[PDB]
Amino acid sequence: KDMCPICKTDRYLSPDVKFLVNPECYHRICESCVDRIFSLGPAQCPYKGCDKILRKNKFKTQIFDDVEVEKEVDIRKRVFNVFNKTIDDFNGDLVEYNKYLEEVEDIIYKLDHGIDVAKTEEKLRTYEEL
Amino acid sequence: SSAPLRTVKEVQFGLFSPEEVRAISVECPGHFIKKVCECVCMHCGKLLLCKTKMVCETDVPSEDDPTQLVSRGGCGNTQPTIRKDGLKLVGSWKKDRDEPELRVLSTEEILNIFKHISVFLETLEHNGAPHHAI
Amino acid sequence: LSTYDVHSPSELLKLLRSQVTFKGISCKDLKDGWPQCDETINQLEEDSKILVLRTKKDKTPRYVWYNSGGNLKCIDEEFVKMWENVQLPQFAELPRKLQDLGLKPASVDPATIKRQKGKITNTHMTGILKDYSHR
Amino acid sequence: DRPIDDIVKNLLKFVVRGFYGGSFVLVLDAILFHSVLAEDDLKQLLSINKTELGPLIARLRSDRLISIHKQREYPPNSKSVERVYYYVKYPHAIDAIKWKVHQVVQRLKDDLDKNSEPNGYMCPICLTKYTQLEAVQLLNFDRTEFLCSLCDEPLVEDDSGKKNKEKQDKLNRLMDQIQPIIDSLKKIDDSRIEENTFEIALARLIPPQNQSHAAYTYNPKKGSTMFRPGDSAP
Amino acid sequence: LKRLIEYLKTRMKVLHVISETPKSFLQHLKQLTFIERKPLRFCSERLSLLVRTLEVTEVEDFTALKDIATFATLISTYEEGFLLIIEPYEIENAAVPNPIMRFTCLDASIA
Amino acid sequence: MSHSGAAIFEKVSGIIAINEDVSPAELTWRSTDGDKVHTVVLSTIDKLQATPASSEKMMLRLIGKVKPQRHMFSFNNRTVM
């Protein structure tokens, strides 16, 4: 609720406590735990059931109060960093632009829910260079 | 020795703070009140103005205009007439309204007061040991 | 005629709850008239229902009290030792130290406690005038 | 009487029963059930001798869970005697509990942080520990093992490399067992508690005995300007 | 719809009164999230179609979305004569702040 | 907290309470051990004698309306008195 699940540092006993998240798994953790765990180097996430390695340099401050929306927005930003077009790109063809937007939404939807992770990522990589 | 050879130019005498003694404590060189109490208040540690003054004077007359009191930091506690009995400081209070009240100024009380002034036994108290024994 | 009629754990709990003071009821008279009381008293202690003062020569129940609090054993010895190891700062400075850590201190420094004509003209009326000083 | 009193008493009861022995529960509960309580009356209630009551009072006074009040009493039958009363100053006890809880949690947090750091080598013969940085300058010409400067003996790697998980469990255990203290403190902070005094505490007195020798009354001397440390409250 | 609601939530945590035009609100919205102006205008129409098609005979739960949809279609349609005010104290005399967001129409000649 | 408190009666300390639910209202004093109990109906009291606030004593007397009955109690705290 308001304490680090690892060290269980309550905000009442530590008003300076500040939590951070990592895009790899989006698990809340306090700054004190981050330093004592990842300062030396990369290590597995200190959560029960999470085995994805992460780096201290990638930690950031959660923007939205909803974890799912935090994940969706980050995926949207990553996808829009490759799939970025405008109405002028199709010479005013609204039908094509709307279809293009729908395809991007499906790509974001698949990446967020992992319907087809392997195929979708390859499509991102293929279009990234091109 | 690799340290530079120098000549002592100054000797700064002083006192050992409790922190320094613990920190300092480990060819070899070896390894290791009454006047002030009458000047400051024994309840807040602020200067009374000093021995003659026997009251903290929480409110003092304004210098600019008479008959216009100005509030100053104080507690209005009448100061004792501190006397040195043996190796302890005994303070005597003069009641406003008839022997004066007498009690021993414990070093803990004086230590607390001196710490409020605005660079250079364990076994007994642990269990039992009525106040007389302590 | 037992001093305190007690032959069941329920009766002991209610009798101890009805006490108007904190004077514990002795076990010497409680054991009289009750074939077994240590077995029940010990069982209640394991349940944290009552408080028992035990002898030092050998564990034996003496004056007991109603347990108006919570569980008797809730903290492991590994934390009891740490609690005993912590030494409080001087009281005059404890509130300041708590404020520095961001914890609201429920106290204040005692140093902050601000505990701070003769010539009568007419005499022929002497002894006649009552002092109507107030109304 | 008031909701504030009940919650404060519960916090005091929880701390004593968990972080203190058994006799401490008896002593503090007696002076919580009653108002300011004379030393003689307390002994009669718990049926314990002075030698046994002294250690309990001293430890409870050190933690400021109980306050003492000495005053002279003048009974017509006997000569003047000095009586000692024990009561609870909620602002003092609550502040002490808050400080100790923070210190205990911080100490475990510091120990966990220290444990995660690399271990420091120790010398067996002289039992003088060396940190990694300090041991690095003790390397020999062949550079096989660190040699103690004094003993000139190979250094042995220190333990605590496996305790990285045990301390996390200990901190988890404490925060779960100490949850009631934090919950009670939050409510206390929301409200404001008045500081008690011997005279104020006497307003809730339930006499322990019928003919107690201690006259449970506060008769301060007239016009006495003398002040003792910690004798008054805001 | 979900991330638009979240953005509105993180704008309620301000510590001082904020007065911004609809254009500024949209620019920051497109920055934090990636919501454009055109989709934000059709929010009311799309929600109405979705609700009508979902067999929502009991609409007690979806009543709140009307306010969000109304806000979305209003701040994206007009840019002049309208102002967005965010205050951390709807009632200045309160122990706990109660943030409120007001979309006000200053020009009475628009309606 | 204005209906109960500590009081001393006949050198015996006890709890003094005023019962108003049962008519007529009466004042009841109960000893710590319960051996001694005395309750007096307030309808019989003529005057209420209280010691001056300038005296160290906190004694209070109720005199019965007519050897008028007198029930005198000593308190421990002036606020309760």
Ligand SMILES: [Zn+2]
């Ligand atoms: Zn943590």
Ligand SMILES: [Zn+2]
């Ligand atoms: Zn993780």
Ligand SMILES: [Zn+2]
């Ligand atoms: Zn002063």
Ligand SMILES: [Zn+2]
């Ligand atoms: Zn060695």
